[PDB]
Structure formats: structure tokens, C-alpha cells
Write a protein that holds these residues in place. Structure first.
Motif, short mmCIF file in Angstrom:
data_model
loop_
_atom_site.label_atom_id
_atom_site.label_comp_id
_atom_site.label_asym_id
_atom_site.label_seq_id
_atom_site.Cartn_x
_atom_site.Cartn_y
_atom_site.Cartn_z
N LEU A 1 35.33 51.47 42.82
CA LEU A 1 35.38 51.52 44.29
C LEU A 1 36.48 52.47 44.72
O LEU A 1 37.49 52.62 44.01
CB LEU A 1 35.68 50.13 44.83
CG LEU A 1 34.71 49.02 44.43
CD1 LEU A 1 35.26 47.67 44.83
CD2 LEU A 1 33.33 49.25 45.04
N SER A 2 36.31 53.05 45.92
CA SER A 2 37.32 53.90 46.59
C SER A 2 37.69 53.21 47.91
O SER A 2 36.84 53.18 48.79
CB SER A 2 36.81 55.30 46.79
OG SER A 2 37.09 56.10 45.65
N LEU A 3 38.87 52.58 47.95
CA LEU A 3 39.26 51.69 49.07
C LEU A 3 40.06 52.48 50.08
O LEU A 3 41.03 53.13 49.72
CB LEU A 3 40.13 50.54 48.57
CG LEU A 3 39.51 49.64 47.51
CD1 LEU A 3 40.47 48.53 47.23
CD2 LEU A 3 38.16 49.10 47.95
N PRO A 4 39.68 52.42 51.36
CA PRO A 4 40.46 53.07 52.40
C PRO A 4 41.81 52.36 52.57
O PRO A 4 41.82 51.14 52.67
CB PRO A 4 39.63 52.96 53.66
CG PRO A 4 38.75 51.75 53.41
CD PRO A 4 38.49 51.74 51.91
N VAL A 5 42.89 53.13 52.55
CA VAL A 5 44.26 52.61 52.74
C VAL A 5 44.55 52.65 54.24
O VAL A 5 44.51 53.74 54.83
CB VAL A 5 45.26 53.41 51.91
CG1 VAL A 5 46.67 52.88 52.12
CG2 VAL A 5 44.92 53.40 50.40
N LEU A 6 44.86 51.49 54.81
CA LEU A 6 45.09 51.35 56.27
C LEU A 6 46.57 51.13 56.55
O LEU A 6 47.24 50.48 55.80
CB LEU A 6 44.25 50.22 56.83
CG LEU A 6 42.78 50.24 56.42
CD1 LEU A 6 42.04 49.07 57.03
CD2 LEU A 6 42.06 51.51 56.82
N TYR B 1 42.86 57.12 50.16
CA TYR B 1 41.93 56.27 49.39
C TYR B 1 42.60 55.90 48.08
O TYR B 1 43.37 56.74 47.53
CB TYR B 1 40.61 56.98 49.18
CG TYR B 1 39.80 57.09 50.44
CD1 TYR B 1 38.95 56.08 50.85
CD2 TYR B 1 40.00 58.13 51.32
CE1 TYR B 1 38.24 56.15 52.03
CE2 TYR B 1 39.31 58.19 52.51
CZ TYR B 1 38.43 57.22 52.88
OH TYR B 1 37.74 57.30 54.05
N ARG B 2 42.31 54.70 47.61
CA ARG B 2 42.84 54.15 46.35
C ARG B 2 41.63 53.86 45.47
O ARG B 2 40.85 53.00 45.84
CB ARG B 2 43.69 52.91 46.64
CG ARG B 2 44.62 52.50 45.51
CD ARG B 2 45.78 53.46 45.33
NE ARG B 2 46.17 53.46 43.93
CZ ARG B 2 47.24 52.86 43.42
NH1 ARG B 2 48.10 52.22 44.19
NH2 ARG B 2 47.45 52.91 42.12
N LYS B 3 41.42 54.64 44.41
CA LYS B 3 40.33 54.45 43.43
C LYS B 3 40.71 53.29 42.51
O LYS B 3 41.79 53.33 41.91
CB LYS B 3 40.12 55.73 42.61
CG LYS B 3 39.64 56.92 43.42
CD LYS B 3 39.27 58.12 42.58
CE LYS B 3 40.48 58.80 41.97
NZ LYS B 3 40.09 59.94 41.11
N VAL B 4 39.85 52.29 42.43
CA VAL B 4 40.07 51.10 41.57
C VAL B 4 38.80 50.78 40.81
O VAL B 4 37.67 51.14 41.25
CB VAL B 4 40.54 49.87 42.37
CG1 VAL B 4 41.80 50.16 43.14
CG2 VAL B 4 39.45 49.32 43.29
#
Length: 113
Positions: free
Chosen positions: A6-11, A106-109
């Protein structure tokens, strides 16, 4: 699959409109996993003053191991009144619902699912 890229949007914490996933440790872990599958989960990087601006119980992503395809392997750990449910590595951030806030990164996990 046991893991999902997943690529999570950093808020930014002050942009977050929905500041947690629910009212119990079991609910917030359930909702976090649902929002991760649906692509509607954001990530807030933890620094001084962030967690008091969010709602408990908290859901963290924590490093589960030392990073395939640029994706850090992570698992979920919940926290309520200073007690954690799960045991894992370093916090990458706190998860929140994403409802269209503009990310800073974005944070790739690789999520253990």
C-alpha cells in the motif's frame, strides 16, 4: 495474500477531519483494516503534540521486520489509556480515516493483513 503493498497518504494532524476509527480497541483495529483494504486510510507522523489532537483508541503502524520493493513491512497495534494491544517495532505513524485531505507525502508499506 498475507501482505499487501500500500501507498498511504501522509496527512498533517491539523487537516484531519475524522480523528480516529471508533470507540474500542477491537473497533479501531477492524475499521483501520477495512479502510486500508478500501484505500481510504491516511497516516499521521507522530511528533510532540500530535496524539493529544487525535481520538483514542489510537491505531499505529509499527515496523514488523528489517523492506521489499521499497515497502517497509508493518503491522497494526492499538493503544487505549496507555495500554497497547499488539507488540511490534518502531512507530511509522498513527492511522486515521482519509476523507480527501491533501497529503504532504506517501509512505509505501507492506501491511501484514
Amino acid at each position: 495474500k498475507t501482505h499487501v503493498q500500500l501507498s498511504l497518504p501522509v496527512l498533517q494532524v491539523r487537516d484531519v477531519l475524522v480523528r480516529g476509527f471508533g470507540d474500542s480497541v477491537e473497533e479501531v483495529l477492524s475499521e483501520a483494516r477495512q479502510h486500508l483494504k478500501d484505500g481510504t486510510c491516511g497516516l499521521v507522523e507522530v511528533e510532540k503534540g500530535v496524539l493529544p489532537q487525535l481520538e483514542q483508541p489510537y491505531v499505529f503502524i509499527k515496523r514488523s521486520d528489517a523492506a521489499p520493493h521499497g515497502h517497509v513491512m508493518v503491522e497494526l497495534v492499538a493503544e487505549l489509556e496507555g495500554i497497547q494491544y499488539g507488540r511490534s517495532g518502531e512507530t511509522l505513524g498513527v492511522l486515521v480515516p482519509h476523507v480527501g485531505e491533501i497529503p504532504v507525502a506517501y509512505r509505501k508499506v507492506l501491511l501484514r493483513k
